[PDB]
């Protein structure tokens, strides 16, 4: 949405909105993908089944996924102690946070940013239902007239 509003990408800002991207066909669509959404979902299902099933079997057996062959990828799938932080050769390419104290500090950065993003995603979905516009458009129209463009002001026109 910010890239459309800035005009860098070729889509009208009421079409580069996140929920009008084909995830919910009734709510809108972008029929110009190189495949129809259902086939993209098929390839998504297969690839994510691989990724998530490997992640789950590493969680259950905290050291596996590095023993069986995988085109040589199995070298980076050893993991660590905490399953949430595997940080092997790939998951921690840049080798950031070389100090366990600095690792804890960066972990708290990650978790605070992630919780903020959870709240933001729930807010964006609720605003999309509630205002039928984009999150950035909602932010801009709130900064325009704060008193009239807010949660209480929009309570009359909610799915219009």
């Amino acid at each position: 949405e910010i890239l459309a509003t800035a005009g860098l990408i070729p889509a009208t800002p009421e079409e580069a909105v996140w929920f009008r991207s084909g995830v919910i066909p009734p709510a809108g669509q972008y029929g110009k993908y190189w495949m129809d959404p259902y086939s993209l979902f098929w390839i998504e299902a297969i690839l994510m089944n691989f990724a998530e099933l490997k992640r789950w079997q590493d969680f259950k057996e905290p050291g596996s996924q590095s023993k069986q062959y995988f085109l040589g990828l199995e070298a980076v799938f050893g993991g660590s102690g905490n399953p949430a932080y595997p940080g092997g050769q790939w998951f921690n390419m840049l080798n950031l946070g070389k100090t366990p104290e600095e690792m804890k500090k960066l972990q708290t950065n990650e978790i605070r940013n992630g919780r903020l993003a959870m709240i933001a995603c729930l807010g964006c979905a609720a605003q999309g239902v509630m205002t039928q516009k984009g999150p950035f458009a909602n932010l801009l129209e709130h900064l325009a007239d704060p008193v009239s463009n807010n949660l209480l002001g929009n309570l009359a026109t909610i799915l219009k």
Partner: peptide, 12 residues
């Protein structure tokens, strides 16, 4: 380099 673990096998 090699952040993908491809060269972990001397043969490969």
């Amino acid at each position: 380099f090699d952040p993908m673990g491809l060269g972990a096998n001397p043969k490969m």
